[PDB]
Amino acid sequence: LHKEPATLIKAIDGDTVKLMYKGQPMTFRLLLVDTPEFNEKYGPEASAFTKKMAENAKKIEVEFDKGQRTDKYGRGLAYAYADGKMVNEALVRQGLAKVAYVYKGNNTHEQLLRKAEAQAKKEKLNIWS
Ligand SMILES: Cc1cn([C@H]2C[C@H](OP(=O)(O)O)[C@@H](COP(=O)(O)O)O2)c(=O)[nH]c1=O
Numbered sequence: 147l148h149k150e151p152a153t154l155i156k157a158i159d160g161d162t163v164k165l166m167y168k169g170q171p172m173t174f175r176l177l178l179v180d181t182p183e184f185n186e187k188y189g190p191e192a193s194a195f196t197k198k199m200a201e202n203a204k205k206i207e208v209e210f211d212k213g214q215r216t217d218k219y220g221r222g223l224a225y226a227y228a229d230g231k232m233v234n235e236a237l238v239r240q241g242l243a244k245v246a247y248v249y250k251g252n253n254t255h256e257q258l259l260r261k262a263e264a265q266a267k268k269e270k271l272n273i274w275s
């Protein structure tokens with residue numbers, strides 16, 4: 147897999163963000179994770195976490211997996227990075243997302259994220275508290 151450039155257009159919530167990619171606006175949904183909706187417990191914390199990570203970043207990149215690159219809603223499916231740090235992983239490590247939506251053929255970083263979820267659970271962080 148490889149990283150490609152994008153720029154932030156707007157934070158949306160914990161697991162979706164509006165980025166410009168190959169010069170076009172797109173909503174990206176983060177692969178392999180599920181944040182609470184804003185209206186749910188830890189939703190506002192998840193939104194804030196992703197917003198801060200994306201806005202503070204000097205460099206945003208997206209990394210598509212081997213399979214589908216857009217979902218049935220026209221959302222781009224990617225791993226997102228802020229200054230080299232994967233947002234998907236960071237959310238899970240902080241207990242602000244669960245590993246979820248692991249479809250065959252778009253699951254390259256599954257075990258990395260499960261290891262992060264285990265550590266968040268051990269620490270009883272946020273959604274595991
Ligand atoms: C993360 C992800 C979601 N989806 C679809 C599955 C779910 O369909 P349904 O809407 O019918 O539940 C929805 C969950 O996204 P959200 O968590 O953003 O709601 O997005 C994919 O198709 N591929 C994916 O990789």
Ligand SMILES: [Ca+2]
Nearest residue numbers: 180181182183
């Ligand atoms: Ca969600």
